[PDB]
Amino acid sequence: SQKNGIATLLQAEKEAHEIVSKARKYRQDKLKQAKTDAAKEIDSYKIQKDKELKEF
Amino acid sequence: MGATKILMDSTHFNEIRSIIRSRSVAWDALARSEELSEIDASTAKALEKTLIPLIHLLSTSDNEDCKKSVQNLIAELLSSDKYGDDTVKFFQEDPKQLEQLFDVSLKGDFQTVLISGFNVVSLLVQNGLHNVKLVEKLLKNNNLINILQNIEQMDTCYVCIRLLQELAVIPEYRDVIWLHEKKFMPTLFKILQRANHLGIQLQYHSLLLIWLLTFNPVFANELVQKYLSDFLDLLKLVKITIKEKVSRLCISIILQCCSTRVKQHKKVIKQLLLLGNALPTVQSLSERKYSDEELRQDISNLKEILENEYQELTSFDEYVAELDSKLLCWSPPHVDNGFWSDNIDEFKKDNYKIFRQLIELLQAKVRNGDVNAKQEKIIIQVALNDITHVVELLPESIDVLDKTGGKADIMELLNHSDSRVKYEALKATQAIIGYTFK
């Protein structure tokens, strides 16, 4: 149906907006996880350096 | 269900499955041929704990029709909504049979080989059991490599391209690809250089791997040097493409390649920009409307990166070195005098001698007799344009050229064979004549 077609077009636009929002949220989560992993890596490197000094 | 699913689900990639889903289906002939075991027939009937027996039956069998049926069953189970999770768990729980399954693939006719490859890829697509060495081993098979390289069956080529793009999801597998790139990389380049739903896959899925492969700056830098012509072709197809997705993917690939993270990137990008005259193309693309926010960001990034050409142009030392260099590429530095008076001031040095040396070099090159060459013709045109700019820069340069005899030689050679060279020489003569009568 033509009215059903217009409704489907609106629903497809809404779904596209939802997919774009999900992509943006994934990007934000990736940035936050990168920051958290950076902090964890800094802690791990500091621990490794401290252990090496004790071994020395 | 399962970890994921195959992207290729159209054209022959589904037509072959549809044709094989019923051709002598259920493997009921095993009840008469007696070549297959009873467990194999029962598994076939049920699919019309069982993961290992089916793999063993498929591997131990030698019948071509039975092999095709087994490959079709494996592909369907991998793509089955009610069995994809089971297959993924079987691969994850006991990946031991995965190597045997990979050994089973890459055999039989074209359709059977494609089905087996699709099944193997779906098996390896899981978040676990990457088996990078096994993936490389499966990438070395002659049949699959030839099928991907061959594009005679455009549907088969599209299926192979989609499978390769899907396989590039794993970054660990991605690094393996660049090392083994030379086997099939330029086949994609030829496909890209030449350029319904099949074309979309050949244009979008193929470029997806390039964006994925560009994630490794070292691999990207290694690949760029060996495919400069392919790089120019990609730059052209970035805007030549009609669908917005293809243009966005090409722009992303170009931006990733031009990122400074690569070795000599700040130099390689500048070299490529001047070689292909990409500044007007970038300006035209920026003038065009962007249908994607990512596309707009890529356009802005390209516009920002275009400042490298401006930086090169302002380098009067670079322009002077290029003039001293035996070759000139008519780069934006060739317009340094127009860009800034610094180039004119530098050329004024030693009482017009900085420009006089270049003028004498150009005159000698013209008298050398090599200017008839097309590349030499372009170099001579660049030299004529530089001489014309110098003449209007200061009348002292014109006086020096007249004294040195370079102006007379240029006027004599104004009737150059090349149309561009002829126009440049006419402009230079007009500049000289205009100052002469002034």
């Binding site: - | 009609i242 007009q430 009568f437």
Partner: protein
């Protein structure tokens, strides 16, 4: 079913949905067909709010360059031999609907380059006038 001259004429309203990417191709095809009148739904806003306003300005600049080229051709009595070819293009458009092409930016750049040679030719004319003035001095003799 087509209708001829019998009673107060026939027409209908229809909405055409099209993808974004194929917008230019669809517009070219419709224009070659020329069997529709799109309602000015987006023209309720002012002209300054047109979606292709910048593209409209670029096309206007290209038209100005073409007008300058025509002026130069008239000033040098050019034959405009492409006028004969333009008739075929109109006939081609009316019959077979040739594709418009996406090289519009290339023609825009070509028009800018043609304006560059136009400025060069104007400078050449000025230099020729100066030389004609210089030739008057050559008449000096003992």
């Amino acid at each position: 079913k087509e209708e001829a001259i019998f009673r107060s004429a026939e027409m209908a309203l229809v909405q055409f949905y099209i993808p974004q990417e194929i917008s230019r191709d669809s517009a070219y095809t419709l224009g070659q067909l020329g069997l529709v009148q799109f309602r000015d739904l987006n023209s309720k806003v002012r002209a300054f709010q047109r979606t292709f306003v910048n593209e409209i300005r670029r096309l206007d600049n290209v038209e100005r360059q073409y007008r300058y080229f025509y002026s130069l051709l008239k000033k040098h009595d050019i034959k405009l031999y492409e006028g004969d070819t333009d008739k075929y293009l109109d006939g081609s458009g009316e019959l077979y609907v040739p594709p418009s092409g996406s090289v519009i930016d290339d023609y825009v750049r070509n028009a800018s380059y043609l304006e560059e040679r136009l400025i060069q030719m104007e400078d050449a004319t000025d230099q020729i006038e100066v030389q004609k003035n210089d030739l008057e001095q050559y008449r000096f003799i003992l």
